[PDB]
Ligand binder design. Structure first.
Ligand SMILES: CCOc1cc(C)c(F)c(C(=O)NNS(=O)(=O)c2ccc3ccccc3c2)c1
Ligand code: NA
Ligand SMILES: [Zn+2]
Length: 268
């Protein structure tokens, strides 16, 4: 018997996938998680006692982004091992393709929280290899189900590319993506490229956005905005066609924007 339901914060959430919590935790009807320190517990009574004792009201690590009540904490897997392992166990309940939960030292974790009077409430995260040979600027990215399709995933994707810009590099998420992640990345790439084309070579868009040339090219192909000439992809778009694409409803929702001015981060 696996964990099939969690209580975290004020949410009850059904599991989507197997996550390797210890056997005696999976057997329980529900797993109870402290939303601040991510300790998982077997019983409502141990949960209620913990909530009166726990002094955490936000993730550990350094707050590298704060604008209004939106916050991002950077958490080193080597500095906060247990927390990052519990985060990976939580994430695995909603990610099919995540395979690493306990060897968290090679990773840095970026925790998105929404803050109110009581504390900073976890929304989602992405992990990232301290050293990525493959040029991946995201390893795994997960938004908890009650926050999905509400702009938080768009914020986290945009945030991962802001880090890449500061690192003077391009990057791409590690594959395979979840289905929602796949849809979200394609819409993000489209929105960014169309906006830049409205206001360039493929190499130019790559340096401006930190999106890889491959991801630009596949996105421009899906939009039918590229020609091919003697082995080279070439941007082929009229300023009117760009506007028409931005009209589509899928870009109508107002984003939670990443304000470069509020990002407190120096590249390693
Ligand atoms: C278990 C998987 O967890 C995830 C993972 C990722 C990467 C997600 F993005 C999400 C999510 O919740 N996506 N929906 S979104 O944030 O509203 C959104 C995202 C991109 C947009 C681009 C352009 C215009 C609007 C957009 C809205 C959930
Ligand atoms: Na649910
Ligand atoms: Zn706690």
């Amino acid at each position: 018997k696996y964990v099939d339901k969690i209580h975290i914060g004020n949410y009850e959430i059904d599991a989507w996938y197997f996550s390797p919590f210890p056997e005696d935790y999976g057997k329980q009807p529900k797993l109870w998680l402290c939303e601040y320190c991510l300790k998982y517990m077997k019983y409502e009574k141990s949960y209620r006692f913990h909530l009166g004792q726990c002094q955490w009201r936000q993730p550990p690590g350094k707050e590298i982004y704060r604008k209004s009540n939106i916050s991002v904490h950077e958490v080193d897997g080597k500095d906060h091992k247990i927390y990052c392992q519990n985060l990976c166990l939580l994430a695995k309940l909603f990610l099919d393709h995540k395979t690493l939960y306990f060897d968290v030292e090679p990773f840095v974790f970026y925790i998105l929280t929404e803050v109110d009077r009581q504390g900073a409430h976890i929304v989602g995260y992405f992990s990232k290899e301290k050293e990525s040979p493959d040029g991946n600027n995201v390893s795994c990215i997960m938004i908890l189900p009650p926050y999905q399709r509400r702009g938080y995933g768009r914020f986290l994707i945009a945030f991962s590319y802001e880090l890449s810009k500061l690192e003077s590099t391009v990057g791409s998420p590690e594959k395979p993506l979840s289905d929602l992640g796949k849809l979200s990345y394609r819409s993000y790439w489209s929105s960014v490229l169309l906006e830049n084309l409205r206001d360039l070579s493929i190499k130019d868009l790559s340096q401006m956005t930190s999106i890889t040339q491959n991801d630009i090219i596949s996105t421009l192909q899906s939009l039918n905005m590229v020609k091919y000439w003697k082995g080279q992809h070439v941007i082929c778009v009229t300023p009117k066609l760009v506007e028409e694409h931005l009209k589509s409803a899928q870009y109508k929702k107002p984003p939670i924007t990443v304000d470069s001015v509020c990002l407190k981060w120096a590249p390693p």
